[PDB]
Design a binder for this molecule. Structure first.
Ligand code: BR
Ligand code: BR
Ligand code: BR
Ligand code: BR
Ligand code: K
Ligand code: K
Ligand code: K
Ligand code: K
Lengths: 99, 99
């Protein structure tokens, strides 16, 4: 069980490796959480590819631009994710958190 | 661990509880196999919800007809599931098997 923190459109479209300073700074910000053990970046292309695989019926219909880049986040205890989700939603540069 | 047997549309569109002739007949063919311990039914509304829960990106284009219903099947010997998979794939009413 891992959390997924969605990023904003311009980072999604233009940063394929989280090498913009803001995306890196945002990865660091998340890593500082007392309840976070690991943070992994997943770009727009890869996330689209992973989804299309798992559900091969939108191969044409759905485009990658519907898929935000994100951080896949391993928490200390995934049953206590409430505080984390709250912080993320209050964090600038974070679009949403997967519910 | 559990096996997932996806159903063709003729059952997926009609039946919310496996209460149509086609669904039950298919359910009975699976349950009576010696290599099957238990069979659970998963309607298309539950399939839509599980999928959108994991990929809300698809909510743009996915209708209730985009996700097939399924049987969640508990095998007697899970490690040895290769002949079961093939049997199901050759069964009328079966769309696909997970993996
Ligand atoms: Br990308
Ligand atoms: Br239904
Ligand atoms: Br059931
Ligand atoms: Br038959
Ligand atoms: K980097
Ligand atoms: K930490
Ligand atoms: K935010
Ligand atoms: K049986």
């Amino acid at each position: 069980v891992e959390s997924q923190v969605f990023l904003t459109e311009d980072v999604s479209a233009n940063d394929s490796s989280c090498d913009t300073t803001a995306c890196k700074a945002l990865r660091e910000k998340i890593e500082t959480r007392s309840d976070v053990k690991a943070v992994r970046f997943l770009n727009r292309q890869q996330a689209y590819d992973d989804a299309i695989r798992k559900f091969p019926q939108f191969k044409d219909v759905a485009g990658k631009d519907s898929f935000p880049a994100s951080f896949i986040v391993k928490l200390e205890n995934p049953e206590q994710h409430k505080d984390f989700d709250t912080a993320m939603k209050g964090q600038p540069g974070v679009l949403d958190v997967l519910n």
